[PDB]
């Protein structure tokens, strides 16, 4: 059934140009417009335009003729958007779509910066002693000093959902991000389970699995 796989995040240099794929799966590509939308961090989305693969009809939101160029390749079912002369304002999540009312893709995160890519340092968070408050202990990982967003934390290689909390990444003084992912267990359990946090930073292929 309808799946649209987008490119992973890209860090791109100012004044340059990035090219985002939307690889359409599980439907026939050639009779459905793919629309593009851009949502910045904590804001609204606006519509970029659409590229109907097939009769190659494209229409752009006027504020984007020039900065984007929608394009499609009829054979691997991939629409593309290219964003030209990238600038800080172009940093946002860009999304593709299946029709008028369709299925959205996952979102590709563009950071447009001058800075270099840093994969994260994973620090441990574990308390100085038990009975810190209640019969609940907390453990966590500090994914400190990485660039660009996003990092994904998972506990026990996906097997631990009950009690994790991974905070929104924070932008530090240095211009790199930090983020804590903590888990709360009852105290009983310090020994019942092994805690592993798996940190992923795909923009710099850094994959760590810490244990706490």
């Amino acid at each position: 059934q309808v799946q649209l796989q987008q490119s992973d995040a890209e860090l791109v240099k100012p004044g340059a140009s990035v090219k985002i794929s939307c690889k359409a799966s599980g439907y026939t590509f050639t009779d459905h417009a793919i629309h593009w939308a851009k949502q910045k961090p904590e804001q609204g989305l606006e519509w970029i335009g659409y590229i109907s693969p097939g009769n190659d009809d494209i229409k752009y939101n006027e504020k984007f003729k020039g900065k984007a160029t929608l394009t499609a390749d009829k054979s691997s079912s991939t629409a593309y958007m290219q964003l030209n002369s990238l600038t800080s304002e172009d940093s946002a999540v860009y999304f593709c779509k299946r029709s008028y009312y369709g299925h959205w893709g996952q979102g590709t995160t563009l950071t447009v910066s001058s800075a270099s890519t840093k994969g994260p340092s994973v620090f441990p968070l574990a308390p100085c002693s038990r009975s810190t408050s209640e019969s609940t202990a907390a453990l966590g990982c500090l994914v400190k000093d990485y660039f660009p967003e996003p990092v994904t934390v998972s506990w026990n290689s996906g097997a631990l959902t009950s009690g994790v909390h991974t905070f929104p990444a924070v932008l530090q003084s240095s211009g790199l991000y930090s983020l804590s992912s903590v888990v709360t267990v009852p105290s009983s359990s310090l020994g019942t389970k092994t805690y592993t946090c798996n940190v992923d930073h795909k923009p710099s292929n850094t994959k760590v699995d810490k244990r706490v």
Partner: protein
């Protein structure tokens, strides 16, 4: 260019109540309007297409109303997982505009933070910077205040907070506050103190460690 205007912008409304989010087109979309709910780093989902038609998995507690220029989303037995942003989009006449969004926090009665403090891990100390993290877990409302005392010096300026989305289930928040010090400044003090205030706590709780 035909602009949709959404109202209200924010809504804190209790479970079980009934919500009404309206969205007015600047001129007439002919009931080509979609409503979306977007949660916190994800793809929007389709609630209602064609200004009243329910999208495939949506609950019955959602209805699309409207015509001409005044369209409406109504959620009637509001539940814990109905928080998030709702957006309406009009599909008649390019450009296909988005409304301004509505953020819905589903209201809860008070809950007090359960506070933890974490010392700088040695691996980190040995890199020249030392972060002390304080955690307020599962509280409500979102407004909590954290004060660091590094000895008994009220640190004003060297901490950053971050807060989770409300939980799908219990509708409570959590918050971290990272304090950042040079290896120097952390090794030249013993008491590190996280002191949390929150309506819901009778009297401010303070967590601390030494070294």
């Amino acid at each position: 260019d035909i602009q949709m205007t959404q109202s209200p912008a924010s809504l804190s409304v209790s479970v079980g109540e009934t919500v009404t989010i309206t969205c007015r087109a600047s001129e007439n979309i002919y009931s080509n309007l979609a409503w979306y709910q977007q949660k916190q780093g994800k793809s929007p989902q389709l609630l209602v297409y064609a200004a009243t038609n329910l999208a495939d998995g949506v609950p019955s507690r959602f209805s699309g109303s409207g015509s001409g220029t005044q369209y409406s989303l109504k959620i009637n037995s509001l539940q814990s997982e109905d928080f998030g942003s709702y957006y309406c989009q009009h599909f008649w006449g390019t450009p296909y505009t988005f409304g301004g969004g509505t953020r819905l926090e589903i209201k809860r009665a008070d809950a007090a933070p359960t506070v933890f403090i974490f010392p700088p891990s040695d691996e980190q100390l040995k890199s020249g910077t030392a972060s002390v993290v304080c955690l307020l877990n599962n509280f409500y409302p979102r407004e909590a205040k954290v004060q660091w005392k590094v000895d008994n010096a009220l640190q004003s300026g060297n901490s950053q907070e971050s807060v989770t989305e409300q939980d799908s289930k219990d509708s409570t928040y959590s918050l971290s506050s990272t304090l950042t010090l040079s290896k120097a400044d952390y090794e030249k003090h013993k008491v590190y103190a996280c002191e949390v205030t929150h309506q819901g706590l009778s009297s401010p709780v303070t967590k601390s460690f030494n070294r």
